[PDB]
Amino acid sequence: DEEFSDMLRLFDFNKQAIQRLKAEAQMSIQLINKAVNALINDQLIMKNHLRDIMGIPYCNYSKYWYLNHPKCWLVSNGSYLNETHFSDDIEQQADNMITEMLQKE
Amino acid sequence: DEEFSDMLRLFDFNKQAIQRLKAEAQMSIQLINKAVNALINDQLIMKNHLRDIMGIPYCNYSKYWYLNHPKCWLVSNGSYLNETHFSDDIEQQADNMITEMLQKE
Amino acid sequence: DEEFSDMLRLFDFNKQAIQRLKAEAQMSIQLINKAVNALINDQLIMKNHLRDIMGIPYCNYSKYWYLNHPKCWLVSNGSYLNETHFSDDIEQQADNMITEMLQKE
C-alpha cells in the first residue's frame, strides 16, 4: 500500500493540472463570450438604425451553408453565444474510482 | 503485473479527463469562431455600404504593430479566424507507449 | 525503484498532454482575442462617425446587469479583452514534487 500512495500522488498532481487548466480556459472563454455577445448586441442596434443598410436583409437558414464558403446579415438575434460550462465532476468520479480500488486493497 | 494495472487505471482516468477537456474546449472555441467570423462578415458589409465611413481606409501591415498600442479599419477580409482543431492522437501514442511497456513486462 | 520508473513514464505522458493542450488552447484563444479586440476597435470608430447613431449613448454600469437579460452601447473602450496567459509552472512543481519523492526513495 506504500507504492500505491506514490502512484496516487503522481495521479493527483496531474488531476490538479487538469482541474486548473479547465478553470482558466473557461474563465478565458466566458470573458470572450461576454465581448462577442455585446458586439452582437450593438451590431444589431446599428442594423436597426443606420438607414443606408436597412435595405439589406438577414440570411435565412441558407446561412448555415454559407459557412462552407453571401450579401445578407449572418448575425441575428439568435447569434448569441450560450454560457460555456465544462464538466467539473473530476473531483467526484476520481474519488469514486479509487474508493473502489481500496475496498479490495 | 498486478500493481501495473492499478497504475494504468489511474493513468487512464486522467487521460480521459484530458480527452474530454480538449473536446469541450474545442467545441466552445469553434462556436466562438463562428460568431466572430460572422460579425466580421457583417461588419465588412457595413463598411462597404455606410457612406459616412466609406472615406476611412483599412490599415496596411502597420496594423500588426497597432496591437502593441490608429484611425483605420483593423478588420479586413483577412481577419477571419481559421477552424481550430487540437491534436487528438492522445488515444494513439498512449497505446504505443504502453505496448512498448508490455513487450518487456 | 524499477516500478516507480514506469509510474513516472505514465505520469509524464499525461503531463505532456496537459502541457500541449494548454499551449494549443491558449494559441487558439489569443487568436480569438485579437479578432474580438479589432472588431471592438472598428465598431467604436463607426460609433463615432455614423451620424444616424451618434444620438445613442453608451450604457453606464447598469451594463453589468443587462447581461442578466437595453438600447445603448454595451461595447466601449473598456470592452477590450486582456491577453490571456495560463499558468505554465507545470514543468516546475512537477520537478519539485518528485525530487522530494527521491530524497527518501
Author numbering:
A (entry chain A), B (entry chain A), C (entry chain A): 306 to 374, 381 to 416
Publication excerpt:
To reveal the interaction between HR1 and HR2 domains of LASV, stable 6-HB covering HR1, T-loop and HR2 domains (residues 306–432), was constructed for crystallographic study. After the single mutation of C310S was introduced, the trimeric LASV 6-HB protein was obtained. Then we continued to try different truncations and deletions in 6-HB, and finally found that a deletion of Gly378 and Lys379 in the T-loop region could yield protein crystal with enough quality for structure determination. The overall structure of the HR1-T-loop-HR2 domain showed a canonical 6-HB structure. Taking a rod-like shape with a length of ∼75 Å and a diameter of ∼40 Å, the LASV fusion core contains a parallel trimeric coiled-coil of three HR1 helices (gray in Figure 2A), around which three HR2 helices are entwined (green in Figure 2A) in an antiparallel manner. According to the structure shown in electrostatic potential surface, the HR2 region of LASV can be divided into two parts: a linear N-terminal region and a helical C-terminal region. The linear N-terminal region binds to two adjacent HR1 helices through hydrophobic interactions, consistent with other fusion core structures, as previously determined. Moreover, at the junction region between linear and helical parts of HR2, several strong hydrogen bonds and salt bridges are noted. For salt bridges, Asp402 interacts with Arg325 (∼2.9 Å distance), and Glu404 interacts with Lys320 and Gln324 (∼3.2 Å and 3.6 Å distances, respectively). These relatively concentrated hydrophilic interactions constitute an anchoring point in the middle of HR2 domain, stabilizing the linear and helical region of HR2 and also the whole 6-HB conformation.
